Design a protein around this ligand. Structure first.
Ligand SMILES: CCc1cc2ncnc(Nc3ccc(OCc4cccc(F)c4)c(Cl)c3)c2s1
Length: 292
């Protein structure tokens, strides 16, 4: 027979995913490595073409779920989220994305500390929130939002990366086993420490921690405090301190991201809009000396 027609006005997903030959890629050096896998700086020469496209290649240490997640990653079309360019299937599956020349935001803030102003910092808060807004719109939880997973295309333009990988490697099992989670506890929403209760509102918590990293120019959350003690401290009401440059206006935005009640936290829509209006008058909201 012929299948009963039932249209839904959802637009076709015409995203392209390129399956790349092993030999189209060369690795220059290592950029980073961790629970997620190793990220290499590299060169992609497409099949038949000449141009040597600067790329990052990620190798991970089920494949139906991977090819499903790869579809999501390639479908992302937003200025402040990365897009997967290609997948290489051999010898093991490699992820290929455009290299960001100014690197990771966490490294960028610490290195350019003495020359980052209030306008720049407040604009990054908007761009991050916007990209997350776009993820949420698609019902996609990042699970591992952190300054370390925000890359700098140019000083005035950041992109979020590494969305999807956490769920792909961990799964959705409510109970943690003895191995625990792969994401760092100190960026994690309280409810996700105890069980896997990952939602857009848990990402919001992580957003709060991410923007604190920026306002402290690469500060380390709960610095020195061992990760075993965190779940107890958070439940006793402990939160990150007010960064020196932060007005109470900015700090309260942060604090609201760390409410016990996940529903009480700001939505990404509210976060982008508030930092937007702050970015219209950035010296009323962040107090950095020399920032005239
Ligand atoms: C610190 C200096 C850096 C510059 C830079 N430029 C581009 N990509 C980088 N890292 C990177 C992170 C994740 C990667 O694959 C995972 C992934 C997740 C979601 C969408 C993607 F396109 C991909 C991939 Cl393939 C790469 C990095 S890291």
């Amino acid at each position: 027979l012929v299948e009963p027609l039932t249209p839904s006005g959802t637009a076709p997903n015409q995203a392209q995913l390129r399956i790349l030959k092993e030999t189209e890629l060369k690795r220059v050096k290592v950029l980073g490595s961790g629970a997620f896998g190793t990220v290499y700086k590299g060169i992609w020469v497409p099949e038949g073409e000449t141009v040597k496209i600067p790329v990052a290649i990620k190798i991970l240490n089920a494949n139906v779920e991977f090819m499903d997640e790869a579809l999501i990653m390639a479908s992302m079309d937003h200025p402040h989220l990365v897009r997967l360019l290609g997948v290489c299937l051999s010898p093991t599956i490699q992820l290929v994305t455009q290299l960001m020349p100014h690197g990771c935001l966490l490294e960028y803030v610490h290195e350019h500390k003495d020359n980052i102003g209030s306008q720049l910092l407040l604009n990054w808060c908007v761009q991050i929130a916007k990209g997350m807004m776009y993820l949420e719109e698609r019902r996609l939880v990042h699970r591992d939002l952190a300054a370390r997973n925000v890359l700098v295309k140019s000083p005035n333009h950041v992109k979020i990366t590494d969305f999807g990988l956490a769920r792909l490697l961990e799964g959705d099992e409510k109970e943690y086993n003895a191995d625990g989670g792969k994401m760092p506890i100190k960026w994690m929403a309280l409810e996700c420490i105890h069980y896997r209760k990952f939602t857009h509102q848990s990402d919001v918590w992580s957003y709060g921690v991410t923007i604190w990293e920026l306002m402290t120019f690469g500060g380390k959350p709960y610095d020195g405090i061992p990760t075993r003690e965190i779940p107890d401290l958070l439940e006793k009401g402990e939160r990150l301190p007010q960064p020196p440059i932060c007005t109470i206006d900015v700090y309260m935005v942060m604090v609201k991201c760390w409410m016990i009640d996940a529903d009480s936290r700001p939505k990404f829509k509210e976060l982008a809009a508030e930092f937007s209006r702050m970015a219209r008058d950035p010296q009323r909201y962040l107090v950095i000396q020399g920032d005239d």
